[PDB]
């Protein structure tokens, strides 16, 4: 089983409900390899920008879960603009924002904020979130 195989089952549009076996399986495996973290964030960013809501949503639950489970190895990867920019394009009107469901956009804003609190060391996350706040995309802390 590869990260791609895992992520594809954890964010599969056909799922009648969340597949925790696959979601947690993906967080466990992305740490079993020193290459995983940077690769997992690229796979998630692509799923999170899916036009298929149920796909991007499950992907956000996967991202959420791995943040709580994994340590700095993964935290640093999500904490880079290389990944935060992908989350910004999904919620920022200047990009996919207009063409993205309020469900997904609000979910991204909830996670972004929950990291500024649980992981204040990740200066990038706070900078990115602060920008969304001054541009209007974020009226208040969820």
């Amino acid at each position: 089983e590869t990260l791609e195989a895992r992520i594809n089952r954890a964010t599969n549009p056909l799922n009648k409900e969340l597949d925790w076996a696959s979601i947690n399986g993906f967080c466990e495996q992305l740490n079993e390899d020193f290459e995983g973290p940077p690769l997992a964030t690229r796979l998630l960013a692509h799923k999170i920008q899916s036009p298929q809501e149920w796909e991007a949503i499950q992907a956000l639950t996967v991202l959420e879960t791995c943040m709580k489970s994994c340590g700095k190895r993964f935290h640093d990867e999500v904490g880079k603009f290389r990944f935060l920019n992908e989350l910004i394009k999904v919620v920022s009107p200047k990009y996919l924002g207009s063409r993205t469901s309020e469900k997904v956009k609000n979910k991204i804003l909830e996670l972004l904020y929950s990291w500024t609190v649980g992981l204040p060391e990740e200066v990038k996350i706070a900078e990115a979130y602060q920008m969304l706040k001054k541009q209007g995309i974020v009226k208040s802390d969820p």
Binding site: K80, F81, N85, I88, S92
Partner: peptide
């Protein structure tokens, strides 16, 4: 490395 913050 890492890229700059999106505008």
């Amino acid at each position: 490395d890492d890229i700059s913050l999106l505008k």
